[PDB]
Structure 1
Amino acid sequence: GPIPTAPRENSLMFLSTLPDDTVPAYGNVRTPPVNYLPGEITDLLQLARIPTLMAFERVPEPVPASDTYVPYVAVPTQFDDRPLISFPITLSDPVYQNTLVGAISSNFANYRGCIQITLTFCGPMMARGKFLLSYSPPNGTQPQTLSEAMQCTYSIWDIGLNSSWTFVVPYISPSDYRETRAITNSVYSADGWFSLHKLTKITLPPDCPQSPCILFFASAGEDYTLRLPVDCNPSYVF
Protein backbone atom coordinates (compact mmCIF):
# COMPACT_ATOMS: atom_id res chain seq x y z
CA GLY A 1 0.00 0.00 0.00
CA PRO A 2 0.99 3.63 -0.43
CA ILE A 3 2.48 5.68 2.38
CA PRO A 4 -0.29 7.68 4.09
CA THR A 5 -0.06 11.41 3.59
CA ALA A 6 -1.93 14.52 4.66
CA PRO A 7 -1.94 17.61 2.42
CA ARG A 8 -1.69 20.76 4.48
CA GLU A 9 -3.41 24.10 3.80
CA ASN A 10 -0.78 25.15 1.24
CA SER A 11 -2.04 23.37 -1.85
CA LEU A 12 -1.12 24.16 -5.47
CA MET A 13 -0.04 27.75 -4.69
CA PHE A 14 3.22 29.21 -5.93
CA LEU A 15 5.18 31.70 -3.85
CA SER A 16 7.41 34.14 -5.67
CA THR A 17 10.27 33.83 -3.22
CA LEU A 18 9.74 30.06 -2.76
CA PRO A 19 13.18 28.50 -2.30
CA ASP A 20 12.89 25.32 -4.37
CA ASP A 21 13.23 24.23 -7.99
CA THR A 22 10.96 22.60 -10.55
CA VAL A 23 11.27 19.57 -12.84
CA PRO A 24 12.67 20.53 -16.28
CA ALA A 25 10.68 19.79 -19.40
CA TYR A 26 13.83 19.27 -21.47
CA GLY A 27 17.22 18.40 -20.02
CA ASN A 28 20.68 16.89 -20.61
CA VAL A 29 22.00 19.73 -22.75
CA ARG A 30 25.42 21.31 -23.00
CA THR A 31 26.48 24.91 -23.45
CA PRO A 32 29.30 27.02 -24.88
CA PRO A 33 32.21 27.60 -22.49
CA VAL A 34 32.54 30.63 -20.26
CA ASN A 35 36.07 30.98 -18.91
CA TYR A 36 37.66 33.06 -21.69
CA LEU A 37 36.03 36.38 -20.89
CA PRO A 38 37.08 38.03 -17.62
CA GLY A 39 35.42 40.33 -15.13
CA GLU A 40 32.97 38.32 -13.00
CA ILE A 41 30.53 39.73 -10.48
CA THR A 42 30.08 37.87 -7.23
CA ASP A 43 28.53 40.74 -5.26
CA LEU A 44 27.26 44.07 -6.59
CA LEU A 45 29.10 45.77 -3.73
CA GLN A 46 32.31 45.24 -5.70
CA LEU A 47 30.26 47.26 -8.16
CA ALA A 48 29.02 49.69 -5.54
CA ARG A 49 32.29 51.28 -4.41
CA ILE A 50 33.14 52.96 -7.71
CA PRO A 51 33.16 56.82 -7.81
CA THR A 52 30.07 58.47 -9.24
CA LEU A 53 29.46 62.10 -10.19
CA MET A 54 26.60 63.75 -8.29
CA ALA A 55 24.06 66.14 -9.80
CA PHE A 56 22.90 69.52 -8.46
CA GLU A 57 20.52 72.32 -9.22
CA ARG A 58 22.16 75.11 -11.21
CA VAL A 59 22.70 78.49 -9.51
CA PRO A 60 20.14 81.19 -10.56
CA GLU A 61 21.23 81.56 -14.17
CA PRO A 62 19.06 79.04 -16.05
CA VAL A 63 20.71 78.29 -19.37
CA PRO A 64 17.87 77.27 -21.75
CA ALA A 65 19.85 74.20 -22.88
CA SER A 66 18.54 70.75 -21.99
CA ASP A 67 18.55 69.77 -18.30
CA THR A 68 20.47 72.66 -16.72
CA TYR A 69 21.92 70.57 -13.87
CA VAL A 70 25.54 70.71 -12.92
CA PRO A 71 28.15 68.26 -11.62
CA TYR A 72 30.43 70.88 -10.02
CA VAL A 73 30.54 73.94 -7.77
CA ALA A 74 31.06 77.53 -8.91
CA VAL A 75 32.75 79.25 -5.97
CA PRO A 76 32.03 83.01 -5.90
CA THR A 77 34.60 85.67 -5.16
CA GLN A 78 32.32 87.63 -2.85
CA PHE A 79 32.47 87.41 0.93
CA ASP A 80 29.28 86.00 2.44
CA ASP A 81 28.92 83.71 5.43
CA ARG A 82 26.59 81.01 4.13
CA PRO A 83 27.85 77.63 2.86
CA LEU A 84 28.69 76.65 -0.70
CA ILE A 85 26.77 73.36 -0.92
CA SER A 86 24.39 71.99 1.73
CA PHE A 87 22.46 68.79 1.09
CA PRO A 88 20.71 66.28 3.39
CA ILE A 89 21.21 62.54 3.65
CA THR A 90 18.02 60.87 2.46
CA LEU A 91 18.79 58.42 -0.30
CA SER A 92 15.98 59.59 -2.60
CA ASP A 93 16.61 63.31 -2.51
CA PRO A 94 17.10 65.12 -5.85
CA VAL A 95 20.83 65.39 -5.12
CA TYR A 96 21.05 61.56 -4.93
CA GLN A 97 19.40 60.92 -8.30
CA ASN A 98 22.17 59.12 -10.18
CA THR A 99 24.81 58.24 -7.63
CA LEU A 100 25.52 54.49 -7.62
CA VAL A 101 24.68 53.81 -3.96
CA GLY A 102 21.57 55.89 -4.53
CA ALA A 103 20.85 53.95 -7.70
CA ILE A 104 21.21 50.41 -6.39
CA SER A 105 19.70 51.57 -3.10
CA SER A 106 16.59 52.82 -4.90
CA ASN A 107 15.31 49.27 -5.32
CA PHE A 108 16.34 47.98 -1.91
CA ALA A 109 14.71 48.76 1.40
CA ASN A 110 17.34 48.92 4.15
CA TYR A 111 21.08 49.45 4.47
CA ARG A 112 23.70 49.73 7.19
CA GLY A 113 26.89 51.72 7.35
CA CYS A 114 29.05 54.56 6.10
CA ILE A 115 28.88 56.72 2.98
CA GLN A 116 32.05 58.16 1.49
CA ILE A 117 31.93 61.40 -0.46
CA THR A 118 35.09 62.85 -1.94
CA LEU A 119 35.76 65.95 -3.96
CA THR A 120 38.24 66.61 -6.73
CA PHE A 121 39.57 70.10 -7.27
CA CYS A 122 40.03 71.52 -10.76
CA GLY A 123 41.77 74.86 -11.15
CA PRO A 124 45.03 76.51 -12.15
CA MET A 125 48.07 75.36 -10.21
CA MET A 126 49.01 78.91 -9.27
CA ALA A 127 45.67 79.22 -7.45
CA ARG A 128 45.29 78.10 -3.84
CA GLY A 129 42.59 78.21 -1.13
CA LYS A 130 41.45 76.63 2.14
CA PHE A 131 38.14 74.77 2.26
CA LEU A 132 36.56 72.99 5.21
CA LEU A 133 33.80 70.40 5.00
CA SER A 134 31.45 69.72 7.86
CA TYR A 135 28.70 67.38 8.98
CA SER A 136 26.12 67.54 11.73
CA PRO A 137 23.56 65.02 13.06
CA PRO A 138 19.90 66.23 13.13
CA ASN A 139 19.47 69.36 15.21
CA GLY A 140 16.19 71.25 15.47
CA THR A 141 16.91 73.78 12.74
CA GLN A 142 19.71 73.51 10.18
CA PRO A 143 23.23 74.65 11.16
CA GLN A 144 23.92 77.65 8.95
CA THR A 145 26.99 79.72 9.81
CA LEU A 146 30.52 78.87 10.67
CA SER A 147 30.22 78.47 14.45
CA GLU A 148 27.50 75.85 14.06
CA ALA A 149 29.37 73.89 11.40
CA MET A 150 32.48 74.49 13.40
CA GLN A 151 31.47 72.71 16.57
CA CYS A 152 30.22 69.52 15.01
CA THR A 153 32.50 67.34 12.79
CA TYR A 154 34.71 68.68 10.03
CA SER A 155 38.00 68.64 8.18
CA ILE A 156 39.86 71.58 6.67
CA TRP A 157 41.60 71.07 3.34
CA ASP A 158 44.53 72.56 1.46
CA ILE A 159 45.20 72.98 -2.24
CA GLY A 160 48.59 71.60 -3.17
CA LEU A 161 50.11 69.12 -5.61
CA ASN A 162 47.34 66.56 -5.20
CA SER A 163 43.73 67.27 -6.05
CA SER A 164 41.32 65.53 -3.67
CA TRP A 165 40.37 64.77 -0.07
CA THR A 166 38.64 61.48 0.85
CA PHE A 167 35.92 62.16 3.39
CA VAL A 168 33.69 59.65 5.17
CA VAL A 169 30.44 60.61 6.86
CA PRO A 170 30.45 58.65 10.15
CA TYR A 171 27.63 56.30 10.95
CA ILE A 172 25.80 57.32 14.12
CA SER A 173 22.39 55.75 14.53
CA PRO A 174 19.62 54.79 16.91
CA SER A 175 19.09 51.45 15.17
CA ASP A 176 21.73 49.48 13.29
CA TYR A 177 19.96 49.20 9.95
CA ARG A 178 18.53 52.35 8.38
CA GLU A 179 15.94 52.98 5.70
CA THR A 180 16.61 54.13 2.16
CA ARG A 181 13.74 56.55 1.57
CA ALA A 182 11.53 58.46 3.98
CA ILE A 183 7.79 58.04 3.64
CA THR A 184 7.64 60.22 6.77
CA ASN A 185 10.87 62.17 7.17
CA SER A 186 11.71 60.82 10.61
CA VAL A 187 14.84 60.47 12.70
CA TYR A 188 15.33 56.91 11.49
CA SER A 189 15.63 57.93 7.84
CA ALA A 190 17.49 61.25 7.88
CA ASP A 191 20.82 61.97 9.53
CA GLY A 192 21.36 65.70 9.33
CA TRP A 193 22.67 67.89 6.58
CA PHE A 194 26.13 68.06 5.02
CA SER A 195 27.85 71.23 3.96
CA LEU A 196 31.18 72.70 2.98
CA HIS A 197 32.41 76.22 3.66
CA LYS A 198 35.18 78.33 2.25
CA LEU A 199 37.48 79.17 5.14
CA THR A 200 39.96 81.60 3.55
CA LYS A 201 39.64 83.24 0.14
CA ILE A 202 40.85 81.60 -3.03
CA THR A 203 44.17 83.26 -3.82
CA LEU A 204 45.47 83.53 -7.36
CA PRO A 205 47.90 85.71 -9.37
CA PRO A 206 46.90 88.18 -12.11
CA ASP A 207 45.91 87.21 -15.71
CA CYS A 208 44.45 83.84 -14.69
CA PRO A 209 40.69 83.34 -14.58
CA GLN A 210 38.36 83.75 -11.61
CA SER A 211 35.99 81.28 -9.92
CA PRO A 212 37.51 77.76 -9.84
CA CYS A 213 35.53 74.52 -9.79
CA ILE A 214 35.26 71.38 -7.63
CA LEU A 215 33.69 68.03 -8.58
CA PHE A 216 31.89 65.77 -6.08
CA PHE A 217 31.95 61.98 -5.89
CA ALA A 218 29.93 59.56 -3.76
CA SER A 219 30.86 55.96 -2.95
CA ALA A 220 30.13 53.20 -0.48
CA GLY A 221 32.65 52.74 2.30
CA GLU A 222 33.60 49.41 3.82
CA ASP A 223 30.72 48.60 6.14
CA TYR A 224 28.03 49.51 3.61
CA THR A 225 25.70 46.52 3.45
CA LEU A 226 22.27 46.17 1.87
CA ARG A 227 19.29 43.92 2.51
CA LEU A 228 15.84 42.73 1.53
CA PRO A 229 14.78 43.92 -1.96
CA VAL A 230 11.56 45.62 -3.05
CA ASP A 231 9.72 46.12 -6.35
CA CYS A 232 11.12 48.84 -8.53
CA ASN A 233 10.16 52.26 -9.91
CA PRO A 234 9.30 51.96 -13.63
CA SER A 235 9.10 55.75 -14.04
CA TYR A 236 12.25 55.81 -16.16
CA VAL A 237 10.38 54.20 -19.04
CA PHE A 238 7.73 56.92 -19.38
Structure 2
Amino acid sequence: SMMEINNTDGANGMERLRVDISVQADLDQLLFNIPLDIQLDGPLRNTLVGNISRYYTHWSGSLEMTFMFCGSFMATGKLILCYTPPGGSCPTTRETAML
Protein backbone atom coordinates (compact mmCIF):
# COMPACT_ATOMS: atom_id res chain seq x y z
CA SER A 1 0.00 0.00 0.00
CA MET A 2 1.07 3.62 -0.49
CA MET A 3 3.50 5.30 1.90
CA GLU A 4 2.82 8.95 2.76
CA ILE A 5 6.40 10.03 2.12
CA ASN A 6 5.59 13.68 1.43
CA ASN A 7 4.02 14.31 4.84
CA THR A 8 4.97 17.98 4.87
CA ASP A 9 3.18 21.26 5.50
CA GLY A 10 1.97 22.56 2.15
CA ALA A 11 1.32 19.09 0.77
CA ASN A 12 -2.42 18.41 0.81
CA GLY A 13 -4.31 15.18 0.40
CA MET A 14 -2.89 13.06 -2.39
CA GLU A 15 0.10 15.35 -2.94
CA ARG A 16 1.38 13.68 0.24
CA LEU A 17 1.32 10.24 -1.41
CA ARG A 18 3.85 11.02 -4.13
CA VAL A 19 7.46 12.16 -4.08
CA ASP A 20 8.42 14.55 -6.86
CA ILE A 21 11.95 14.45 -8.25
CA SER A 22 13.38 17.02 -10.63
CA VAL A 23 16.26 17.23 -13.08
CA GLN A 24 19.25 18.13 -10.89
CA ALA A 25 22.00 20.66 -11.51
CA ASP A 26 24.40 19.04 -9.03
CA LEU A 27 25.61 15.46 -8.66
CA ASP A 28 24.87 12.70 -6.14
CA GLN A 29 21.85 14.60 -4.77
CA LEU A 30 19.81 13.38 -1.81
CA LEU A 31 16.16 13.19 -2.88
CA PHE A 32 14.38 12.05 0.27
CA ASN A 33 14.54 9.75 3.28
CA ILE A 34 11.99 7.68 5.17
CA PRO A 35 11.75 6.84 8.89
CA LEU A 36 11.19 3.08 9.31
CA ASP A 37 9.28 2.47 12.53
CA ILE A 38 6.04 0.81 11.42
CA GLN A 39 4.86 1.24 15.02
CA LEU A 40 5.04 5.06 14.99
CA ASP A 41 3.42 7.94 13.14
CA GLY A 42 5.22 8.65 9.89
CA PRO A 43 5.10 7.74 6.16
CA LEU A 44 4.54 4.07 7.04
CA ARG A 45 1.74 4.40 9.62
CA ASN A 46 -1.30 4.58 7.34
CA THR A 47 -0.50 1.50 5.29
CA LEU A 48 -1.94 -2.00 5.44
CA VAL A 49 1.12 -3.31 7.27
CA GLY A 50 1.37 -0.21 9.45
CA ASN A 51 -2.30 -0.13 10.46
CA ILE A 52 -2.54 -3.82 11.33
CA SER A 53 0.85 -3.91 13.05
CA ARG A 54 -0.38 -1.14 15.32
CA TYR A 55 -3.03 -3.50 16.70
CA TYR A 56 -0.01 -5.39 18.04
CA THR A 57 3.12 -4.58 20.05
CA HIS A 58 5.83 -6.95 18.82
CA TRP A 59 6.85 -7.59 15.24
CA SER A 60 9.42 -9.50 13.22
CA GLY A 61 10.07 -10.06 9.54
CA SER A 62 11.30 -8.47 6.34
CA LEU A 63 9.61 -5.46 4.78
CA GLU A 64 9.61 -4.58 1.10
CA MET A 65 9.38 -1.13 -0.44
CA THR A 66 8.42 -0.84 -4.07
CA PHE A 67 8.64 2.41 -5.99
CA MET A 68 6.87 3.06 -9.27
CA PHE A 69 8.27 5.82 -11.49
CA CYS A 70 5.42 7.85 -12.98
CA GLY A 71 7.24 10.27 -15.27
CA SER A 72 6.82 10.22 -19.07
CA PHE A 73 8.19 7.45 -21.30
CA MET A 74 10.90 9.74 -22.66
CA ALA A 75 12.19 10.36 -19.13
CA THR A 76 15.19 8.35 -17.93
CA GLY A 77 17.21 8.06 -14.76
CA LYS A 78 18.97 5.94 -12.19
CA LEU A 79 18.32 6.16 -8.45
CA ILE A 80 19.84 4.36 -5.50
CA LEU A 81 17.64 3.25 -2.60
CA CYS A 82 19.49 2.52 0.62
CA TYR A 83 18.51 0.77 3.84
CA THR A 84 20.80 1.66 6.72
CA PRO A 85 20.67 -0.65 9.77
CA PRO A 86 20.39 1.30 13.08
CA GLY A 87 23.30 2.72 15.01
CA GLY A 88 23.94 6.31 14.06
CA SER A 89 22.54 9.39 12.36
CA CYS A 90 20.75 9.06 9.06
CA PRO A 91 23.25 9.29 6.16
CA THR A 92 23.14 12.56 4.20
CA THR A 93 25.55 11.70 1.39
CA ARG A 94 25.38 8.92 -1.19
CA GLU A 95 28.93 7.78 -0.38
CA THR A 96 27.75 6.97 3.13
CA ALA A 97 24.29 5.60 2.32
CA MET A 98 25.79 3.39 -0.39
CA LEU A 99 27.58 1.38 2.33
Q: Is TM more than 0.5 here?
A: yes
What's the counterpart of residue 54 of structure 1?
3
- 1:93/1:69 CA distance change after superposition, 3 Å: farther
Q: Is the 8 A contact 2:35 2:42 kept in 1?
A: no
Structure-to-structure mapping, 1:156-171, within 5 angstroms: none
Structure-to-structure mapping, 1:73-152, within 5 angstroms: 73-80=19-26, 81-91=28-38, 92-151=40-99
Q: Is the 8 A contact 2:84 2:97 kept in 1?
A: yes
User: What residue identity is the alignment partner of 2:36?
Assistant: I
- RMSD value over aligned CA atoms? 2.1
Structure-to-structure mapping, 1:1-238, within 5 angstroms: 52-55=1-4, 56-58=6-8, 62=10, 67=13, 69-80=15-26, 81-91=28-38, 92-151=40-99
- TM (norm. structure 2) is 0.81
CA distance in 2, matches of 1:124, 1:132: 20
Secondary structure of 1:104's counterpart equals helix
Of the two structures, which has the highest relative contact order with CA contacts closer than 8 Å and spacing of 6 or more?
1
Structure with the higher fraction of residues in strand conformation: 1
What's the counterpart of residue 13 of structure 1?
none
User: What residue identity is the alignment partner of 1:107?
Assistant: Y
What is the CA distance between 1:74 and its match in structure 2?
Answer: 0.8
Task: Report sequence identity in percent.
Answer: 34
User: What residue identity is the alignment partner of 1:72?
Assistant: R
Q: Unmatched 5+ residue regions in structure 1?
A: 1-51, 152-238
**Structure with max Cα Rg:** 1
Q: Unmatched 5+ residue regions in structure 2?
A: none
- TM (norm. structure 1) is 0.37
Q: Is the 8 A contact 2:82 2:98 kept in 1?
A: yes
Q: Is the 8 A contact 2:2 2:17 kept in 1?
A: yes
CA distances 1:166-196 after superposition (whole Å, capped 9, x unpaired):
xxxxxxxxxxxxxxxxxxxxxxxxxxxxxxx
Secondary structure of 1:70's counterpart equals helix
Q: Is the 8 A contact 2:30 2:93 kept in 1?
A: yes
CA distance in 2, matches of 1:95, 1:69: 13
What is the CA distance between 1:69 and its match in structure 2?
Answer: 4.9
Structure with the higher fraction of residues in helix conformation: 2
Q: Is the 8 A contact 1:143 1:149 kept in 2?
A: yes
What is the CA distance between 1:67 and its match in structure 2?
Answer: 4.3
